Structure formats: structure tokens, C-alpha cells
Amino acid sequence: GVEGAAFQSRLPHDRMTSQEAACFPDIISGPQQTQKVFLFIRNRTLQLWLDNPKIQLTFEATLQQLEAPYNSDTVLVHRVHSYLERHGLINFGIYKRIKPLPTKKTGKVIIIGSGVSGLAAARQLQSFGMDVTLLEARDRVGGRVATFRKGNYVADLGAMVVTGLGGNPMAVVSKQVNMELAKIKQKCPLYEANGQAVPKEKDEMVEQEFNRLLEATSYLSHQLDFNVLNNKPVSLGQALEVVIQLQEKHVKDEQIEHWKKIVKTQEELKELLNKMVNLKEKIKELHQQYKEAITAEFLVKSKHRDLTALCKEYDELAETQGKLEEKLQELEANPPSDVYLSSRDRQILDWHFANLEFANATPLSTLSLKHWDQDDDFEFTGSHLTVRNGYSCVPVALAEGLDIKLNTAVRQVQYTASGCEVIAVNTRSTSQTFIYKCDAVLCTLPLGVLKQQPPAVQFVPPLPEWKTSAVQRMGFGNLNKVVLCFDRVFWDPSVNLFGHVGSTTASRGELFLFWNLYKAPILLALVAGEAAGIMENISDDVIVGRCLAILKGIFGSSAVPQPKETVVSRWRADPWARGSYSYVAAGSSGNDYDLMAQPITPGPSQPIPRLFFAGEHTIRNYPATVHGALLSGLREAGRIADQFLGA
Numbered sequence: 147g148v149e150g151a152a153f154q155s156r157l158p159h160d161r162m163t164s165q166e167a168a169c170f171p172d173i174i175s176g177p178q179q180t181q182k183v184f185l186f187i188r189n190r191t192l193q194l195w196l197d198n199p200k201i202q203l204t205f206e207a208t209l210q211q212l213e214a215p216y217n218s219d220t221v222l223v224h225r226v227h228s229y230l231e232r233h234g235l236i237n238f239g240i241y242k243r244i245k246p247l248p249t250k251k252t253g254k255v256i257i258i259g260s261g262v263s264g265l266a267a268a269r270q271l272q273s274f275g276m277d278v279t280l281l282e283a284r285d286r287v288g289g290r291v292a293t294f295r296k297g298n299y300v301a302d303l304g305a306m307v308v309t310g311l312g313g314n315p316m317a318v319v320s321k322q323v324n325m326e327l328a329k330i331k332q333k334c335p336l337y338e339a340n341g342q343a344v345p346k347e348k349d350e351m352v353e354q355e356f357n358r359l360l361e362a363t364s365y366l367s368h369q370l371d372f373n374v375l376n377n378k379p380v381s382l383g384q385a386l387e388v389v390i391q392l393q394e395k396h397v398k399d400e401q402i403e404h405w406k407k408i409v410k411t412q413e414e415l416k417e418l419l420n421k422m423v424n425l426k427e428k429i430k431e432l433h434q435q436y437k438e439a440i441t442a443e444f445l446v447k448s449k450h451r452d453l454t455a456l457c458k459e460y461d462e463l464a465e466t467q468g469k470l471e472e473k474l475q476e477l478e479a480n481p482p483s484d485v486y487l488s489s490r491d492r493q494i495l496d497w498h499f500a501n502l503e504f505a506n507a508t509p510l511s512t513l514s515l516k517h518w519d520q521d522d523d524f525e526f527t528g529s530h531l532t533v534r535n536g537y538s539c540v541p542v543a544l545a546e547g548l549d550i551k552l553n554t555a556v557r558q559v560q561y562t563a564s565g566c567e568v569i570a571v572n573t574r575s576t577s578q579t580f581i582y583k584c585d586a587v588l589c590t591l592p593l594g595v596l597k598q599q600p601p602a603v604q605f606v607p608p609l610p611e612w613k614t615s616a617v618q619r620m621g622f623g624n625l626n627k628v629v630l631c632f633d634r635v636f637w638d639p640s641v642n643l644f645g646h647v648g649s650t651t652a653s654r655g656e657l658f659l660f661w662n663l664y665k666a667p668i669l670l671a672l673v674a675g676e677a678a679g680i681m682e683n684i685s686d687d688v689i690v691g692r693c694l695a696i697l698k699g700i701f702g703s704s705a706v707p708q709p710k711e712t713v714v715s716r717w718r719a720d721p722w723a724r725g726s727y728s729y730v731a732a733g734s735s736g737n738d739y740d741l742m743a744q745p746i747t748p749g750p751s752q753p754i755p756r757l758f759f760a761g762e763h764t765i766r767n768y769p770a771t772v773h774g775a776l777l778s779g780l781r782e783a784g785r786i787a788d789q790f791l792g793a
């Protein structure tokens with residue numbers, strides 16, 4: 147109940163957030179019980195919205211739907227309700243309005259980009275009564291959530307999975323858009339470059355190795371301050387190499403201590419065979435004497451009294467000859483490993499790297515080893531899902547009733563303390579251009595776009611140093627996919643995933659994974675790490691060929707017709723994107739995502755914020771995702787409304 151609401155809202159259910167404390171400075175300085183009441187109303191209200199997010203949740207509705215000691219402080223409830231509504235915590239996505247939108251509209255805002263962050267914010271601003279318009283360079287909305295659809299085929303070339311619903315706003319949006327989510331089975335059989343499979347231990351041993359290795363990386367950073375080596379920020383790749391070497395080293399040592407023992411023992415067997423050989427010389431000599439044989443009766447008794455002493459010693463040695471050799475054996479039969487890495491084991495340990503690079507959108511040498519997991523104390527509760535209906539349904543549903551200008555690429559953004567102007571061009575006819583006047587501009591331009599040195603969008607006035615330093619510092623990875631549409635299915639339906647073991651450590655992530663989750667005859671081969679960019683420079687036919695080759699190596703040549711339809715993404719070559727999403731670069735931190743979020747005041751000639759930023763690269767705890775983009779939009783729509791409503 148109520149407690150699960152605060153959760154689905156990324157909110158403490160017994161504490162007040164820094165924000166809530168600022169907007170309610172009275173309740174914070176005020177007693178406790180009162181607060182406890184606040185938290186309840188707050189929690190209850192979210193429950194109500196969360197229980198049915200397909201219809202607007204009004205103050206009035208929030209009043210009779212209450213317990214009896216609460217439905218009485220009308221004022222607090224209203225305060226709380228407005229707070230929640232303002233910040234996009236209780237009235238976002240696509241819902242039914244019960245009260246038509248005002249006929250006239252306060253301010254004027256221009257939003258650059260029809261991505262999820264764009265549509266999300268525009269949608270908020272529109273209900274806050276502002277005048278919004280969106281300029282999109284492409285001929286469709288969604289942006290980095292692209293959906294391929296031909297015949298009965300449908301696949302996501304962009305965003306593909308919903309990473310859990312526990313606290314994920316995509317849960318609300320999901321029930322609003324009517325989204326068909328299907329869980330992804332946690333099972334991936336790894337096949338080898340030659341065409342065939344991995345035992346099991348092989349996988350269990352490596353995956354184990356992967357984990358422990360990655361654990362070290364962590365231990366060295368936080369626990370040891372190992373992130374600034376030779377006036378340079380330490381990389382993940384770096385640490386992964388430091389680590390492996392010390393493990394490669396431990397192996398050498400053991401192979402040496404072993405070799406030493408084996409050696410010593412061999413030398414002792416030699417020094418014994420010698421002592422034996424030289425003892426028999428003495429023995430044999432007594433059997434020469436014993437044969438020639440009162441002092442002949444006491445002589446024979448003595449020589450045989452001695453010859454039984456030497457012989458009793460020759461047995462001592464024969465006892466060592468056995469106890470030593472015995473030990474000699476042990477060492478050759480139970481000897482340690484030659485390497486910590488087989489030409490194969492490594493080639494497999496790579497996969498787990500490729501996979502890691504695929505998740506991060508960039509090779510490890512580029513990840514700030516110190517900060518690549520600040521976003522982890524913020525993950526969702528639940529199995530990761532997919533959208534077999536096409537993630538494109540979310541943005542297409544949010545794009546309803548909005549003034550969106552497609553095929554309109556922005557070239558310049560001028561902003562002053564008297565207003566702002568946006569200049570764009572028709573991507574279908576450069577002959578015609580446009581000018582848009584507005585009070586505020588909301589930039590949701592991909593970070594890979596704000597990085598093109600020969601700029602695609604010129605700001606006037608250009609933009610402070612701190613803003614650009616952040617842009618230069620932050621990372622923008624790449625990651626692509628191949629779509630294979632087949633006549634029929636030729637792989638286990640029980641198999642959602644399954645990887646390709648790459649030959650070289652440099653080509654670790656080239657077609658290192660195949661998806662099938664598409665409860666249909668559709669296959670997705672992925673490209674991560676260094677292969678991402680590079681491969682974008684290859685004809686589709688050639689890329690497909692490599693795929694069929696890889697697959698034919700698992701089900702043999704004939705259980706694999708040619709695809710009926712095929713598609714290849716190239717998010718780096720795409721002008722409207724210039725990559726996949728952000729990643730914490732070696733010399734950057736979460737603080738940089740905060741800088742990218744900070745708005746810009748344009749004077750003077752007493753200034754007010756005119757240029758605002760939202761997008762997958764402006765949200766600290768949820769970067770590189772669809773929910774981060776959507777949350778960023780809701781964040782700015784609030785900040786903007788807060789600036790232009792009152793003043």
C-alpha cells in the first residue's frame with residue numbers, strides 16, 4: 147500500500163527530501179506529528195495516482211478518497227498536491243484531463259528535439275498552461291528510441307529494455323500507452339568462434355574470474371586511492387590490466403616454486419643413487435672377504451657382524467629411494483597450472499568485457515574507473531523487460547496534441563535577457579529557413595551533438611566555459627545492432643540470449659551477442675566496444691554475411707536460410723545523435739551531469755534563466771536511459787514553470 151507508493155516514486159517513506167524541506171520550510175521547522183501527517187498525505191496521493199495513472203488526479207478527487215483525520219486539513223493536502231503535480235510526481239505521461247486546457251497560454255517556450263525528454267517536458271508545460279513548440283530534425287519522434295517495422299516484423303534499433311519497474315516511472319507510462327512488456331530470461335549459452343559451445347565450468351570459472359577481477363578494480367579505487375597515476379585519471383581498462391597481471395604473476399611464482407621442488411627432489415635422488423652405488427662397493431667387498439673365512443670363529447662372527455650393519459644401512463637408503471620418488475611422482479601428477487589464461491579462456495574472459503562495454507556503450511580504457519557506478523545505488527527492483535510492441539509507442543503516444551515541427555533542424559540559438567530566438571532549416575529543402583521567438587529555450591540535444599567541434603548548433607552568446615568544459619569532459623559512447631528477419635525460427639525459444647566468442651581482444655564486441663526475445667522470427671546481433679564505430683564503415687551485406695557465418699557455425703549451413711529483411715544501425719554516423727548515450731569518462735564525475743543540467747542566465751545589460759537543458763546527459767542518478775531522459779524532462783518543465791509563472 148502507501149509505503150510502496152513512495153517507493154515507486156524514488157522517495158523515502160519516512161523522511162522528507164531536501165526539496166520537500168525547501169518548499170515546506172514551515173513543516174520542517176514545525177513539530178513531528180504534523181510532518182508524519184505530511185508524509186502520509188504525500189504517500190497517499192502518490193498511491194492514488196499510481197493506482198490509476200490513466201486519468202488526471204485532481205485536488206478535489208484527492209479529498210474524498212481520504213481517511214478521516216486527513217481529509218480535513220484541506221490546505222495541507224492542496225499544498226502537497228500542487229507540490230507533487232508541479233514536480234511531475236503525480237500527473238505525467240499521457241492521462242485523461244477532466245478539465246480542458248486553458249484557452250489562452252501564459253509564456254512561450256521552444257523545445258529542441260522530440261525525444262522522450264523533449265516530449266515529456268513539452269507535455270508538462272502544455273498542461274501548466276504554457277505555449278510550447280518542438281523542433282525536430284528527423285521525420286519522426288522518439289529520437290534515440292527508434293523502432294523498425296516492416297511486414298509483421300518489428301524491432302528496436304534504439305532503446306530496447308525497461309530495467310525493472312521497482313521505482314521506474316516507465317511503469318506508469320507503460321500502463322498509459324498500453325505497452326506489451328516481456329521479461330528477458332537470465333540465460334546465455336556461449337558458443338565459440340569455431341562454431342561450438344562451452345562446457346559449463348568454463349563459463350562458471352570465467353564468470354567467476356570476471357567478478358573477482360571487477361571486484362579488485364573497485365577495491366583499488368575507493369579503498370586505495372588508485373585513480374591518479376602519472377598526472378592522469380585511471381581507467382577501468384587500466385585497473386583490469388593491473389589486476390590480471392598480478393594474477394598472471396601469481397601463476398608464474400607457483401609454477402616456479404613447484405619447479406624448484408621437483409628439481410631439488412631429483413637432485414636428492416641422484417645423491418642417493420650415488421651413496422647406494424658406493425655402499426655396494428663396500429658391501430660387495432665384504433662378500434669377497436666373508437668367503438675367504440678361535441680368531442677365525444670370532445672373525446667370521448665379526449665380518450658377518452659388520453656386513454649385516456652395512457646391509458642394514460643399504461635398506462635405510464632403499465627406504466628413502468622410495469619415500470623420495472613417491473614425492474617426485476606427486477609433483478608431476480598434481481602440478482600447478484602453466485597459465486592463468488588459455489588462448490581460449492582469455493578469448494572468453496573478453497566476452498564478459500565486451501558485454502560490459504556494450505552496457506556502457508564504450509571500451510573500458512575510456513571509463514573513469516572511480517565513478518562508473520554512482521548510478522548503481524539507484525537501480526530498479528524487478529526483472530528487466532522488453533517491449534515486443536516497439537518502444538516507439540511511448541514517444542508516439544506522448545506526441546499527441548503537441549505542436550511538433552518535423553524535418554526542422556536547428557542551426558542557431560540566440561538568447562538575451564529580453565527573449566530568445568531559434569533559427570532552423572527545413573531538412574527537406576534548405577532553401578527555406580525559419581525563426582522562432584520565445585521566452586525560454588529548452589535544449590534536449592544529444593551530448594554527441596553538443597560535442598561536434600565544427601558545431602551543428604551555434605549559441606549566441608556562446609556558452610560559458612564551465613558548460614563546454616563539461617561537454618568536452620563527458621563521454622558519449624556508441625553501440626550498434628543488426629536485425630535479422632527470418633522466414634522461420636532455427637534456435638531454442640527458451641533461449642533469449644547467447645553469445646559469440648570473439649577471436650581477438652580488440653574485436654571483443656563484434657557480434658558478441660544475439661537476441662531473440664522477440665517472440666517472433668527476429669534476431670538481433672550486437673556490436674560493442676571498439677567494434678561499434680569501426681563496423682559502421684561496412685556495407686550491410688558484408689555485415690550480415692558475418693552474422694550468417696557465425697550462426698551457421700552453430701546450427702550448420704542449411705538450418706539457416708538467408709534473411710528476408712535486414713537492418714543495421716549506425717548511431718555514431720547519425721547526425722541527429724552522433725553516438726548512443728553518455729558514460730562517465732576517465733576525467734569526469736557525476737558533478738558533470740549536474741553542470742549539464744544547470745540553466746543559463748544571459749545578461750547582463752537583472753537577468754533570468756533563458757536557456758535550459760534536459761536529456762539523458764543531465765540526470766545524475768539515471769543517465770544513459772529512457773527513464774532518465776523522461777525524468778530530466780519533468781525536472782525542467784518544473785524549473786521552467788517555476789520561473790515564468792510567477793514572474
Ligand SMILES: Cc1cc2nc3c(=O)[nH]c(=O)nc-3n(C[C@H](O)[C@H](O)[C@H](O)COP(=O)(O)OP(=O)(O)OC[C@H]3O[C@@H](n4cnc5c(N)ncnc54)[C@H](O)[C@@H]3O)c2cc1C
Pocket residue numbers: 258259260261262263264281282283284287288289290291303304305306307308309554555556557590591592595602603625626627717721722723725726727760761762763770771772773775
Ligand atoms: C543502440 C541504443 C540502445 C539503447 N538501449 C537503451 C535501453 O535498453 N534502455 C534505456 O533506458 N536507454 C537505452 N538507450 C538510450 C535511450 O534511447 C536514450 O537515453 C534516450 O532516447 C535519450 O532521450 P533524449 O530525449 O535525451 O534524446 P534523444 O531521444 O536523442 O532526442 C534528442 C532529439 O533532438 C533531435 N535533434 C538533434 N539535433 C537536432 C537539431 N539540430 N535540430 C532539431 N532536433 C535535433 C534528435 O533527432 C532527437 O529526436 C539506448 C540508446 C541506443 C543508441
